[PDB]
Amino acid sequence: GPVPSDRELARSLPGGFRSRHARVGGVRLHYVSGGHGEPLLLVPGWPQTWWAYRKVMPQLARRYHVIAVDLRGMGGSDKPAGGYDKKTMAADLHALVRGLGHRQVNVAGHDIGSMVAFAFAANHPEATRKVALLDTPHPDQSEYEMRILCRPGTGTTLWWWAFNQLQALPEQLMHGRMRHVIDWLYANSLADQSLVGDLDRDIYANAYNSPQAVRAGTRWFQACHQDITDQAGYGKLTMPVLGIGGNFTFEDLRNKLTAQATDVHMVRASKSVHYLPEEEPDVVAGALLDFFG
């Protein structure tokens, strides 16, 4: 393989993490687990893998039994034809942790994984001790207000939200070329490019480089219309909620969570644009430790 296997990556971490799989509802999920204490489910997003949490997993494992998953369609997990709505991907994770003998878990999610974390809390409150959303709120009607063009100096264009709606073309252009996508994303977020090194970037590129892998990634985005419909039906979250927001999304995240939950806490990742677990790991680990207790 071009990059180290997940088994090797897992072993390279302090804290005795191990790479595993579990089959839930016919979908085989890959995850890495380790540490001792109450269960903590960590959910990554696009275009990343469980490896995105590499910087905070050892600190977290000191207090929690960490379970860092690859979503349906992601990394070492199966890439089925459908079920890429966040409600369904949340049910995967619910089945996973219940299968591992946990009645309720702490949950933290980032990017697409944050949407799943929120859907997890909304659909399975009894299995949700507390939930943390990193940067990304669940889709709602505001998604329909995203603009194609920004006036100069007024923000970053969310081009991938449009491009990933497409059939066929995304896998045709991006297969074998995902390192370029990853580099663009990081060029437009990281304050210092060395925050994510060459090999880690290639670990992600390897995960997404097959046509099937690119395609599965796009399904997360194409499911937005369904996600928005589902969001309208959700009741208010009553368990403790944490929002950690970067400089660009903090206010929006605060507004949406406060309207969607009764018990909200906010932490500002003041030096981050989007990739919180990689941009400010100590702030993220500390916030999660403080919040989950």
Ligand X SMILES: C[C@]12O[C@H]1[C@H](O)c1c(cc(O)c3c1C(=O)c1cccc(O)c1-3)C2=O
**Cβ at position 159, least distance to ligand X in Å:** 9
- From the list 21, 28, 180, 271, which residue makes contact with a copy of itself (rule: CB under 8 A)? 180
Residues at the contact surface with ligand X, assessed by CB under 6 A: 45-46, 111-112, 136, 156, 160-161, 185, 188-189, 248-249, 273-274
Q: Of 29-37, 41-49, 177-185, 236-244, which segment contacts a copy of itself by CB under 8 A?
A: 177-185
Residues 136 and 110 sit within 8 Å (Cβ to Cβ) = yes
**Residue 240 and residue 16: Cα distance in Å, rounded?**
29
Q: What is the DSSP string of 38-104?
A: SEEEEE--TT--GGGGTTTHHHHHTTSEEEEEPPTTSTTS---SS--SHHHHHHHHHHHHHHTT-SS
CB of 95 or CB of 173, closer to a copy of itself: 173
Interface pick for a copy of itself out of 2, 151, 199, 233 (rule CB under 8 A): 151
285 Cβ contact list (under 8 Å, min separation 6): 55, 56, 59, 60
Shortest distance (Å) from residue 210 CB to ligand X: 19
Closest CA to 122 of 163, 92, 80, 91: 91
- Minimum CB separation of residue 163 from Na ion in Å reads 10
Subset of residues 205 to 264 that bind a copy of itself, contact rule: CB under 8 A: 224-225
Q: Please report, as residue ranges, which positions from 215 to 244 form the binding site for Na ion (by CB under 5 A).
A: 215
User: What are the residues facing 144 on neighbouring strands?
Assistant: none
Rounded Cα gap, residues 2 and 97, in angstroms: 31
**4: cis peptide before it, omega within 30°?**
no
**Looking at beta carbons only, is 216 or 287 nearer to Na ion?**
216
Question: Are residues 97 and 39 in contact, defined by beta-carbon separation less than 8 angstroms?
Answer: yes
Q: Which of 81, 148, 199, 232 forms a contact with a copy of itself (CB under 8 A)? A: 148
65 has which bridge partners? Answer: 39
Does residue 181 interact with a copy of itself by CB under 8 A? Answer: yes
Residue 75's nearest CA partner among 5, 172, 145, 142 is: 5
Least CB distance to Na ion at residue 217 (A)? 9
- Least distance (Å) from ligand X to the CB of residue 190? 9
Yes or no: say if 280 and 274 are a contact pair by the CB < 8 Å rule.
no
Token pair of 178 as six digits: 């995902």
Do residues 32 and 50 lie in contact, with contact meaning Cβ atoms separated by under 8 Å?
Answer: yes
Coil/strand/helix, residue 69: strand
Binds 200: which of a copy of itself, ligand X, Na ion, none (CB < 5-8 Å by kind): none
| Count of residues of this chain found to bind a copy of itself when the rule CB under 8 A is applied | 29
CA angle 19–216–146, rounded 5-degree value: 120
Q: Which of 28, 177, 236, 271 binds a copy of itself (CB under 8 A)?
A: 177
Considering only residues 179 through 218, tell me which ones interact with Na ion, judged by CB under 5 A: 215
- For residue 114, the minimal CB distance to ligand X (Å) is 7
- Which of 79, 42, 26 is CA-nearest to residue 244? 42
Question: Is residue 166 near a copy of itself by the rule CB under 8 A?
Answer: yes
Q: Given the complex with a copy of itself, which of 12 and 157 has the nearer CB atom?
A: 157
Can you give the binding site for Na ion, defined by CB under 5 A?
170-171, 215
Can you give the binding site for a copy of itself, defined by CB under 8 A?
143-152, 157-159, 161-163, 165-166, 168-169, 172-174, 177, 180-181, 184, 224-225
